[PDB]
Each structure stands twice: as structure tokens, then as C-alpha cells.
Design a protein around this nucleic acid. Structure first.
Lengths: 104, 109, 80, 96, 180, 97, 98, 95, 106, 82, 97
DNA sequence: ATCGATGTATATATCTGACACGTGCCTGGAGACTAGGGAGTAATCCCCTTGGCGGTTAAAACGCGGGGGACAGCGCGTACGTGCGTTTAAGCGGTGCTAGAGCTGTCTACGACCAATTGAGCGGCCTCGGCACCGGGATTCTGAT
DNA sequence: ATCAGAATCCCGGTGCCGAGGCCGCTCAATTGGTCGTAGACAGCTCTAGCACCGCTTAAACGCACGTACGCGCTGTCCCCCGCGTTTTAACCGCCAAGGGGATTACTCCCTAGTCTCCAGGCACGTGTCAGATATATACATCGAT
């Protein structure tokens, strides 16, 4: 019932690597793998609602934006990001993907 | 032929049932007027008259007079809440006003 | 004419004393004369309309009572 | 990166302790998720028409003549090989 | 007179001749914005010029934001090229500009309350709702957004000589109410 | 000549007064006020009953319309006592001829 | 020194006296003439019953006394004792006469 | 009955006479209809009281004219009296 | 051929209905011939005033359809009809946009 | 049996009604006073309307009953029948 | 960050709600209050939807007019805040208190 | 000063449901005629209104000192407005169902209406007592000490 | 607390005029009987009002904080109040003419009432377009940076 786009992250594609590795090793199957992924979805949703506290902002220049199927996508060049919970990191390119907070 | 007996005596009223019936019929209120409508209306008029006459006679006794004057009717109407509500938009000639001084206008020690 | 000045300062003071007014500013007299004049214009206009409808030349007490009842303020003791 | 380390630690502890019953309905073993989390930590030691990535939830998007304001929350950034976690984020840029 | 108005904005509509399923062009076209519960059209913009498009499901689409008529036609051709690269049988046809926006300044304040008094046939000023007169000039069909600051902005045309003629027509009547 | 009769409630108000205060008199100006009061209340109740009959598409003013007009016009304790008196008089009148 | 009352004592005595009594507080001939000059504006060569002018005077005095009651209350609302004409405007405006 | 009776079409004809390009909402038509019933009832009640006051038993043009002078404010009263007398003159002339 | 009384009087309001309502409204036992003509003329004039000012208010709001808000603006801006309808509530009419000058910022 | 619905006339509703009335600043006791004033006004109007309904021997309060109850109180309402 | 001066969004609210025309009280709580009040006069009553709407129109118009008078008598006391005594003065001068 | 946020005007596309219009039909209004009572008109009469005169007295007008209230200014603290995040219930949409509005048919009591009559009720006359006034003493309130 | 003094209350004689009772006329209420129809009641229909359920989401609610406005205090000054003196016109009483309100008599014409016909207006159904909504652009205004 939640948004299924968090396997695009490092933690998510590492889980899909782990699950299809164990599929290739020959004990699990697609039903087990998919139930793993929606359980992963629920637990990342709860861990991001409760136990995040840091403050992170990035300011830059936008290259390409977009909005379809309840998803905003942005491309920002030459962007400056700072970290506070005091480190500023300069990064040339970053891509932003999001979905609406209230699921429908 | 039977002896003529007025409708107000039948209803046990002092107010004229027949006159109220004629005033309802000539008053252009409806094309028909029921039999009990003048009886009921005369009774209501008599009751309201009796209420103001209690209160005005009491006002006359409090002023140590034996005749009801317009001041007594004014005091009778304004000192009762419901007759004041009924006659809120009504002024009574030579009635004066209620004695009422606002408390901030009273002198201080 | 001066007939609006015939509603004198002591008369307006007495009317305010009956209203329970303890202190009266100096401009109340002109203000009260204006208010009384427009009230009388409304009531006398309606009473004269009632009189002319009856093809009369005298303003009866009925005309004033009827005009006042049209104004929403009912006067007792003058008939009706 | 300390808070993000606690984040992935609690998320891997979380996943391995719900997946008991819906894995054991098939009923094979527990060594699979044991060495899964072992190799998991070993892994984690490391034209005008249609890797750096940040991924989250949005709240509102507004637009001026060229500038946006965007308030962003519930996500984890993937940047500089240092994955960080944020409570709130703001995205503003010009379109020139 | 010695002043020529400067052009600000051109809006133009172009039909394409086919029905569009805008979901695939939203997926396969950059800068596309769609929300079915909000607005039933995709909105995309390009770098040259700073202009936008509103592609509808009926194939009729509108371009606004350009500052010249030929370059606006070029932008509409570019949007047609985008939808052709997407792969819909949508050809460039029916190019017509709908309105042009021109602006000018007079460098003096205006006794425009007196102008509204003297020209109440086409004037409307009531201050706290809108602080600018909306003058409805009939020759040609141009509306006026004039202010006490002197920013004379007028719009409602189909061709630039029309707004030039409207400007030179309104020039003396605005000049004769120079405030102070 | 002999002027025409001017009907009034003066004698009925006086009879009510002798019942309610057996030794209290009433001046002529107060009698004029009480006559105006009875006329005004009669007109108000009759007009309300007329509108009541007109609203319900009826052409007869009965005791029901008078009772409802009394409930509409009079304040609460006056309304309930006047309804009691009117109902008592109507049932006494119907009990007799 | 001659005896002089404090300002406001005689005013309160007049308030009690004119609230105890019922007579007309305006002299009858000036009110008579005022009614006639107002009636000249609507119809010339009018005549008045004496009871008509008395009815007009009763109504006018009752209206002015009630207006002065509301004026006094809205002066007291302004933490005042003296009534100024702004009190009369407030009373007539709230009463729906302006 | 299922029949309901209203001043809707007459208000519409007057509206087309005044502004022959402007429509009207159903709720605004209900307001206009209630306005016409209210003004009719006020003028008819005043004329009825005028007939009762002068011991007459008929409502005539004079009763309606005096009721209009009583109820309508001054400038409206002047114009409505002029309109009513003009219509009565046209009706009697055409018979 | 029968021609209606409104056409005889040159009115749009129904003279016949006004006569029927005067007879059935219990106002007097008789109703004159000119009374419904006069009353229909007066009602038509008042309707014309309300509708003219409401159409002007609708043009002010760039609307070609009279809504209750336009009727309220028409009634309350004109002082004659405001005095006529001072005790009348218009549903969905709103109020006049009146701000007291004291409450305005300095 | 419905109970304690005068609190349903909320604080923001009374603030909005004051805003339409032109009120810039509102005290804290205004809400309770306005709830009392609204309560007594609706007792008057609804008592008259229920009386009109009961006279017609009906069991529902017709909108015309409310209109006549408002007309009886001098508060004539246009837009729900005349 | 940015915060408005106290009174500015209040004035803009005044302009907005004087420009608008809809009913300001939530419809269902007003209907529940009407039902609760009507339980005193007669049990198990019913209401036309238009009846509750007429009641809400009248009640809101009455309160807006009362708040206009309340604001006027608050300004009269050299204030801008309306107090309960402002409502009491307005209601008593109007003749209902 | 700059600028971000908020509000307003203008050209255009979409979508909807309320609005304007066409049609049948039926009941209410018009045509025609009669009767009778209300209203218009003339004549009379008497009463009440208007106008004047005279005095006389209480009320109004005027002047003045002063003190108490109106009003402006100042300070302060608290209550209210603004803005945020969280909670909650209104509102929309849909379904069901049944109480009650509303209409129709029928029959009966009830109210208009008419004629005879008489007794209540109104006009008129007269009288006496209740209240206003005048006059004096006792009581209470107020300003200054 | 108290005292001089002004205002007010208590008591009694006078007296006068209005309330109250009586008498006669007369006309309106009463009694009686007829007749038409308004409405009371039964019964059927079908509409909309109530009740429930679920989703959404905008509104309500709780809180926190700053600030500006309500309220209290003080000073000043001016302008209303109390009071004495002069003037003036309100008022009371009386007279007198006559304008018009009120009544009566007579006629006539205007509207109620009835019958017949027919078309104006309203219920119903249906296309379709004014307005709500949303976008983009240019410009004015408020308060914080």
C-alpha cells in the first residue's frame, strides 16, 4: 500500500542483489523475494518516520525537472550541500526523486 | 321561542363573544369564522385585561390611589417582564417611564 | 422658521432627565432638534398621507395613531 | 555518518527480526539470514528529450518565474559514497 | 511620439490534428508536469526561449512566454518536433498568436483620477481593490493596465501595429493629465 | 342631532375590573388606553390567525388558529395561561348550547 | 457664602423628579407651531385636531426619552457621564435609523 | 396540487426588457419571486387597512396609490405612483 | 379573440393573477378594476429597479448572470431599496465590503 | 438525544462571522457570549417554526415554516419561498 | 523567518469574508445544534434540508449584523477589540436585551 | 534597497450542471351578461378649529464662577494574533428504507345567510367623592466644618 | 460626627369636575331553519429525510511567542452645572366666526357571480454554454532580511 521506489537506493538494490543471489543459490523463490521487499518497504517507512534527526539542505542550479505519476524528479548541477545534526560538501551533479507523503 | 341568552354567559366571560364574532367576520380575516373562535379570542382578551388590571390596581394601591390612571398602566406593563415583552413597541400616553438611574451616575463617597 | 428653536434647551434637558441623563453636552440640543425634526417629518408625512386619502383637510388623532402604528411604534390612549 | 550507521544497523536488525514467520512458513533454516547479514555487513564495508542520487518523500512544490521551493522529508541521500539521512530538506534552484 | 512600447509576452495556440494520450509524453518528455486531480494537461518548458507549452488530450496546445512572433513560431515548431519524436501523428498546423503584451513608461505621474472623471465611459478606478485603471480602448480592441507609477502596460492585440496605434492614440490623453 | 354609536370595550373592561379589584376605579384616559390595548391585541391575534389560515390553505378561522396565534404572539407564561383560559371557555361554551 | 449644591446633585434630583412624573416636558404651543411648519411641507392649509397634536407630542416625547436612555447607556459604555452627539449617532445607528 | 404558481416568467420578461443579454440564477429568481410576494403583501395589507380605516369595502386605485406612497420611500414612491397611474390610464383608455 | 389585461395595460406582470390574489387574499370584500392594474405596474417597476441595479452589479463583476450576491449589492448600495428592504435578509447575499476607518493601518 | 452541540459553533466559525462583520480584533469571551446569543436566537425562531409546523399537523419543519417564523419576528428572509 | 504584523492577515480575512458569500458555520454542527434545540419544543422532529439552510442563513446574517453593531460600539469606546459588553450594549440598544 | 509572499488583470482550454428554450395541456383568466349594493354627490348642520385679546406667572434666556469630568499622554503587562504541527470531524459520494408529505374521494357537520325579535349597550343627565391644590409642620438629604 | 439649610413627605380642609350610576332608545346579537361546501378522514403513492459506511482533506485544535492594545494613573483645562436676575411668551380664560367633519338621501354604475371557451403558463425534457478551475505573464504592496 506504500510507494515501491525505495529499491532504487543502495540499501534496496543491495537487497535485490542478495535475494536474487540466494535465488540463484537455489533455496528461495519469487514469492519469498517479493514478501521480503514489501516488508523492507514497511520497515524503511517506519525507520524514516521515527529515527531520523539530522538536518540536510542542498542549494544549486537546476538542469532538468519533471512530474509524472505522483513523482517529482529533478536534476541539479553545481550544488553545495551542508550537513548538520557542520561539514559542507561540494558536488557537481545530483538527482532528486520523490513521491507524495500521503499515499492514495 | 327560547329566552335569549348571550354567548358570553354561555362561555362564562365578560367580554362580548358576539361582538368579537362580528368583528372577526367584518374584519376580513377569513371568509369563514368558526363557532369557537370568538369564544376563545374573547377569553384571551379577558385574561390579558385581567392581568393588566391586577398589575395596575396593585400599582394604584402602592401609590395609595383608588383609580387606575395611565401612570399605573405604564408601571404595570413595564414592571412585568412578559407584558413588557408583549408591549415592547407600544408607548402609553401620559405614562411616564420607570424610575431607573444608572449606578455609575450615583454619587460616590 | 424659528419653530425648531421652540424646542428649547430646558425642554431637551427635561427630556434627557426623564431619560436618566446626568450630564449633557452643548451640542446635544442641536442634535436632538435634528432628530426630533426628522422623526416628526416621517410621522407627519404619513399622517398627512392618511388624511389626504380620506379627502379630509384636518389631521385627526386617528391619522397620527395610524401613521405611528405604520412606523412600528404604537400609541395607546388616543383611540384605535 | 554516525546517525546513518545507526539507521542501517536498526533497519537490518528490523528486517531480520520480522522475516522469521513469513520465512519459516516455507521453513528452511535461519542460517540463510545469519550469513545474509554477515555478507551484508561485509558488503557495506564498501539533448532536450528523454552514480549520484537522492531519494525521499515530498510535501509541496511551488514555482516562480524561474525558482522553485520544495520541502522534502523521509529519505536517505546517496552522495560522495557517504550515505546520509535527513529529517527535513529544502531544494531551491534557478532555471536559466 | 518619440517613445515606442517594448514587447513583453506573446501567447499563441497551435493545433496538431490528433488525440493525445499525455501519460506517455509525460514519461518520455523532460520538464513535463502532470497531475490528473489538479490540471488535465502536461506543462513543459524549453531553454530557448523561456517559454512553456500546455499540451492537451485533444491535440490543441498553447505557447506563452515568448518575446517575438517568429521565435514563438519556432518554439511551437520545436514543441511539434518534441511530440513527433515521441511518436504521435501530430503535424504543425494552425499557428496564430492570441495576444501580445507591451509595456511603456511615461516618466511622470498621472492625474488619472481626473482622467477617470473626464473619461468615465471607459475608466474604472477603485483603489483598495486594484490600484490601476483598466481603460477599455475600442480602437483598436486593447485593454489598458496603467498606473500612477507611469508603467503603461496594454494588451489584447493580434499584431504589433495595432498596439502601436493604440499607444499613439492614448498618448495625448495620458499626456494632458500630467500630475504636478 | 344624535351622533352614531361608538363601540368600545369600556363596559367589559369595567366589569373585568370590578371582578379583579372590587373597589378600584379607572380614569377615562386609562380606559382609553385599555380599549386601545384590547383593540391592538385583537388585531394582532386575528391577523396572526388569518395568516395561519392562509398558510395552511384553509378558509376558516377556528379555535385552533386562535390558539396557535396566541402561542405565537404571547410570551411563554402569558401564552400558556391564555391558552388555558381559552380552552376552558371553549369547552364550557360547547358543554352548554 | 450662599449655599451651592455640588455639580450633579441637582441633576440627579431632576432625574428623580422627571422620572416620577408623567406630564409633557415640551411646551405645547412651540410644539404646535413646529408640527404646523412641518405639515406645511406636505400639504398647505392644513388643520389639526387638538388630540392629534397631543398624540404627536406624546409620541415625540416618548421617542426622545427612549433615545436619551440609549444615548446614556452608550455614553456609559464609553466610560463617560456626559452625552455627546456621537452617542446619539451610535444609538440611532445600532437601532437601524441611519 | 402538483401545480406551483410563481412570478418567474414575468421577472424574466422584465429582465429581458432591462438587460437583454443578462441571465439570472434559479436562487436569484427565488429571491426575486419572494421579493415580489413580499412587496405585494405589504402593499395589499396597507391598502386593506386603508379600506378598513375609511369604512370602505373595496380596494381601488386610490387605495393602492396611497399604500405605495406610505410604504415605498420617497423617490421610489414618486416613480411608482407615476408608473401606476400611467398603466391605469392606458388600461381605461384601451378599456 | 381574447387579449389579456396586462397587454391592455402595457405591463409584463399579470393583471389577472394580481386580481385573483387580491380577491383571494382577504383584503376587502370587493376589489376595483384599476387596483390590480396599478399594483401590477408598481410591482413591475420595483422588479425593474432591482433587476437593473443587479444587472449593473453583475457587469461590475464581469458576469452575465444575476446571482444573489448581485441582488444584495444592488439593494444595499441603493439607499431607496435599502430603506425598502432594511429588515430583509437575502440568502447567499453576503454583506457590503465595508471596513471601518479606525481599523485601517496608519 | 443530542447533547452539547453549541460547542460545534467553533471558535474559528465565530471569528469568521466577526470577520464578515468587519471586526478586526476579538476578545476571548466573545465566543461564549456569541454562542449564548446564537442559542437564544435559534430558540426563538425554532419555537415559532415548530409552532407553525404543529399547527399544520406535520412532523417535519418545512422551510416555509422557518420563513414564516422569521417574518413573524421581523427578520424577513428571501430565497426559500414567499 | 517572515511573520506578518499583527492585524494584517486579520484585515485581509475581513476583506476576504466580506467579498465572499458562502455560509461560515460548518453545516453539520449547525444542523445538530438545530436538532438539539428543537428537541425541547417537540420530540422526534424532522427537518427539511432547506429548513436547516434557511435557519443557517438567518442565523449567520443575524450574527454578522450583530457583529457590525458590536464593532461600532467597540470603536465608540475608543477600542478596536470587541468585548462581551459590546455585544450586550448592541443587543440592548437594538431592543432585544 | 531588495525581495519574497500575497493579491489582481488579461487570453485560453476543459467540464459540468444549471440555465434557456421547445412542447403538451389544463386550468385559470378573459368575454359576455345580470343584479344589487356600495360609493359618488348634493344638501344641511353643528361643532370644533382657528384667530384674537389680556394678564400673569412660571419658564426661558443670559452671565458667571468653578469644579468635575473629557481627554491626551504615558507605562505596562497580558491577552490575543500569527504561525506551526497535530488531530479530527465535516463533507462528499453512495446505498437503503421508510416515515411522512401530499394528493385524491367521499361524506358530513358546520358556518354563511336570512327573517323576527328583543335586550344589551350606547348616548344623555346628574351627582358626589377622589384627587389636586393650598397651607402648615415633621422628615430626610446635602454641603461644609 | 454634626448642624444650617433646602428639598421633600405627612396631614387636613377645600372644591370641583370627572367617574359612576340611571333612564330611554335602537339596533345588533340571538334563535331558528336551510343549504352548500370546507374540511375531516381514509387510503394510496412516492419523496425526501434519516441512517449508515468509507475516504479525503481541509478545518479545528493545542501551543508558543511576541507585541500592541486595553486599562489604569495623572495633569490639565474647559465647559457644563448651579444659581441669581431679567425678560418673554406659554397658558388660562373668554369670545366669535365659519370650515369642514359628519350625517342623510338618492341614484347609478361597477364589481361579484356565473357560464363558456381557449390559451398562458407551468411541468417536463433537453441542448449547451457561463462559470469554476487552472496556467502563465506583468504589476502593486507589506514587512523582514
Amino acid at each position: 500500500g506504500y510507494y515501491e521506489l525505495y529499491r532504487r537506493s543502495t540499501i534496496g538494490n543491495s537487497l535485490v542483489d542478495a535475494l536474487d543471489t540466494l535465488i540463484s543459490d537455489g533455496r528461495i523463490e519469487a514469492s519469498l523475494a517479493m514478501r521480503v521487499l514489501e516488508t523492507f518497504d514497511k520497515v524503511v517507512a517506519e525507520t524514516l518516520k521515527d529515527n531520523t534527526q539530522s538536518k540536510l539542505t542542498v542549494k544549486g542550479n537546476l538542469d532538468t525537472y519533471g512530474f509524472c505519476d505522483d513523482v517529482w524528479t529533478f536534476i541539479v548541477k553545481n550544488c553545495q550541500v551542508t550537513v548538520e545534526d557542520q561539514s559542507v560538501i561540494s558536488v557537481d551533479k545530483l538527482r532528486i526523486v520523490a513521491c507524495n507523503s500521503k499515499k492514495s | 321561542r327560547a329566552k335569549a341568552k348571550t354567548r358570553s354567559s354561555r362561555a362564562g366571560l365578560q367580554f362580548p363573544v358576539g361582538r368579537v364574532h362580528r368583528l372577526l367576520r367584518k374584519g376580513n380575516y377569513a371568509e369563514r369564522v368558526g363557532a369557537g373562535a370568538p369564544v376563545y379570542l374573547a377569553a384571551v382578551l379577558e385574561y390579558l385585561t385581567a392581568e393588566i388590571l391586577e398589575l395596575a390596581g396593585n400599582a394604584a394601591r402602592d401609590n395609595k390611589k383608588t383609580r387606575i390612571i395611565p401612570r399605573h398602566l405604564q408601571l404595570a406593563v413595564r414592571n412585568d417582564e412578559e407584558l413588557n415583552k408583549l408591549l415592547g413597541r407600544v408607548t402609553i400616553a401620559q405614562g411616564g417611564v420607570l424610575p431607573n438611574i444608572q449606578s455609575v451616575l450615583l454619587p460616590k463617597k | 422658521r424659528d419653530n425648531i428653536q421652540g424646542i428649547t434647551k430646558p425642554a431637551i434637558r427635561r427630556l434627557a432627565r426623564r431619560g436618566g441623563v446626568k450630564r449633557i453636552s452643548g451640542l446635544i440640543y442641536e442634535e436632538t432638534r435634528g432628530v426630533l425634526k426628522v422623526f416628526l417629518e416621517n410621522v407627519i408625512r404619513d399622517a398627512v398621507t392618511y388624511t389626504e386619502h380620506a379627502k379630509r383637510k384636518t389631521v385627526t388623532a386617528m391619522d397620527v395613531v395610524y401613521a405611528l402604528k405604520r412606523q412600528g411604534r404604537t400609541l395607546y390612549g388616543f383611540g384605535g | 555518518n554516525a546517525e546513518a550507521s545507526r539507521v542501517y544497523e536498526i533497519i537490518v536488525e528490523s528486517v531480520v527480526n520480522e522475516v522469521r514467520e513469513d520465512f519459516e512458513n516455507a521453513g528452511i533454516d535461519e542460517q540463510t539470514l545469519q550469513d545474509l547479514k554477515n555478507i551484508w555487513q561485509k558488503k557495506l564495508t564498501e539533448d532536450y528529450l528523454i552514480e549520484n542520487l537522492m531519494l525521499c518523500l515530498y510535501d509541496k512544490v511551488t514555482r516562480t518565474k524561474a525558482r522553485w521551493k520544495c520541502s522534502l522529508k523521509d529519505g536517505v541521500v546517496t552522495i560522495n559514497r557517504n550515505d546520509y539521512t535527513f529529517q527535513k530538506a529544502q531544494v531551491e534552484a534557478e532555471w536559466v | 511620439s518619440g517613445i515606442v512600447p517594448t514587447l513583453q509576452n506573446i501567447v499563441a495556440t497551435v493545433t496538431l490534428g490528433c488525440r493525445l494520450d499525455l501519460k506517455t509524453v509525460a514519461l518520455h518528455a523532460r520538464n513535463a508536469e502532470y497531475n490528473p486531480k489538479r490540471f488535465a494537461a502536461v506543462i513543459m518548458r524549453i531553454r530557448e526561449p523561456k517559454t512553456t507549452a500546455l499540451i492537451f488530450a485533444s491535440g490543441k496546445m498553447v505557447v506563452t512566454g515568448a518575446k517575438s512572433e517568429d521565435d514563438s513560431k519556432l518554439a511551437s515548431r520545436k514543441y511539434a518536433r518534441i511530440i513527433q519524436k515521441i511518436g504521435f501523428a501530430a503535424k504543425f498546423t494552425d499557428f496564430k498568436i492570441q495576444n501580445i503584451v507591451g509595456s511603456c513608461d511615461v516618466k511622470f505621474p498621472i492625474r488619472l483620477e481626473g482622467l477617470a472623471f473626464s473619461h468615465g465611459t471607459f475608466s474604472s478606478y477603485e483603489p483598495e481593490l486594484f490600484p490601476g485603471l483598466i481603460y477599455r480602448m475600442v480602437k483598436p480592441k486593447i485593454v489598458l493596465l496603467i498606473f500612477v507609477s507611469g508603467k503603461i502596460v496594454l494588451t489584447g492585440a493580434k499584431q504589433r501595429e495595432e498596439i502601436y496605434q493604440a499607444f499613439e492614440a492614448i498618448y495625448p490623453v495620458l499626456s494632458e493629465f500630467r500630475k504636478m | 342631532r344624535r351622533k352614531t354609536r361608538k363601540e368600545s370595550y369600556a363596559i367589559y373592561v369595567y366589569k373585568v375590573l370590578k371582578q379583579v379589584h372590587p373597589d378600584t376605579g379607572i380614569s377615562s384616559k386609562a380606559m382609553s388606553i385599555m380599549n386601545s390595548f384590547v383593540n391592538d391585541v385583537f388585531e394582532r391575534i386575528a391577523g396572526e390567525a388569518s395568516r395561519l389560515a392562509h398558510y395552511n390553505k384553509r378558509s376558516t378561522i377556528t379555535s385552533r388558529e386562535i390558539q396557535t396565534a396566541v402561542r405565537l404572539l404571547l410570551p411563554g407564561e402569558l401564552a400558556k395561561h391564555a391558552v388555558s383560559e381559552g380552552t376552558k371557555a371553549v369547552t364550557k361554551y360547547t358543554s352548554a348550547k | 457664602k450662599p449655599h451651592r449644591y455640588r455639580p450633579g446633585t441637582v441633576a440627579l434630583r431632576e432625574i428623580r423628579r422627571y422620572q416620577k412624573s408623567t406630564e409633557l416636558l415640551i411646551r405645547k404651543l412651540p410644539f404646535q407651531r413646529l408640527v404646523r411648519e412641518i405639515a406645511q411641507d406636505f400639504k398647505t392649509d392644513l388643520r389639526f385636531q387638538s388630540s392629534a397634536v397631543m398624540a404627536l407630542q406624546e409620541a415625540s416625547e416618548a421617542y426622545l426619552v427612549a433615545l436619551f436612555e440609549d444615548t446614556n447607556l452608550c455614553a456609559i459604555h464609553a466610560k463617560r457621564v456626559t452625552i455627546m452627539p456621537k452617542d446619539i449617532q451610535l444609538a440611532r445607528r445600532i437601532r437601524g435609523e441611519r
